[PDB]
């Protein structure tokens, strides 16, 4: 069903996450972690304290799709297990040092063609697929985008709900 998903998305904030490569999104799905550039890291840390749920919606650049979405379960933290990110042209591990823990809500893909009817008020009502890494998505647009994804029947949202 969709009832527990709607409960998790209640009063959530949504952020677009753009990755330069598929390898880091696969690593993120396997390990439950994400790292971003310092400007977005500060934005996400502020949002984590302010909202019942912060939702990251992932899109690999040039893929024409979203690769899934996840809930932040922690603020960023330094040290800890070193994540072996594949680094873009000039993106040292120092610029990705903060690690957020995340709980995946959906690991299924959604092609951009299926979201063409959704526009983001916080990006000049451009289609929601358009936006820079870290772009915030307004509540109503973000909720409807997350409901567009195929159900991920391998995920049990019971444990996610207890962390709210």
Ligand X SMILES: CNc1nc(Cl)nc2c1ncn2[C@@H]1CCCCO1
Contacts with ligand X, 52-91, as mask; x by CB under 6 A? ---------------------------------x--x---
Q: Among 51, 8, 9, which residue's Cα sits nearest to residue 158?
A: 8
H or E, element range at 161: helix 158-163
| Out of 9, 14, 19, 54, the residue judged to bind ligand X by CB under 6 A | 19
Which region among 32-40, 46-54, 112-120, 146-154 touches ligand X (by CB under 6 A)? 32-40
Cα angle for residues 86, 78, 48 (degrees, 5° grid)? 95
Phi/psi zone of residue 62: left (φ > 0), alpha (ψ -120 to 50 degrees), beta? left
CB of 95 or CB of 139, closer to ligand X: 95
Binding region for ligand X (CB under 6 A): 18-21, 24, 35-37, 85, 88, 96, 133
């Amino acid at each position: 069903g969709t009832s527990k998903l709607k409960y998790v998305l209640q009063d959530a904030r949504f952020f677009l996450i753009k990755s330069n490569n598929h390898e880091n999104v696969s690593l993120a799905k396997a390990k439950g972690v994400w790292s971003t550039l310092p400007v977005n890291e500060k934005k996400l840390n502020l949002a984590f304290r302010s909202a019942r749920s912060v939702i990251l919606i992932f899109s690999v650049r040039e893929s024409g799709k979203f690769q899934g979405f996840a809930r932040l379960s922690s603020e960023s933290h330094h040290g800890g297990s070193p994540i072996h990110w594949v680094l873009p042209a000039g993106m040292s591990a120092k610029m990705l040092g903060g690690v957020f823990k995340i709980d995946w809500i959906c690991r299924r893909e959604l092609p951009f063609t299926k979201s063409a009817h959704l526009t983001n008020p916080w990006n000049e009502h451009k289609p929601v697929k358009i936006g820079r890494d870290g772009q915030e998505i307004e509540l109503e647009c973000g909720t409807q985008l997350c409901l567009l994804f195929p159900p991920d029947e391998s995920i049990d949202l019971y444990q996610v709900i207890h962390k709210m």
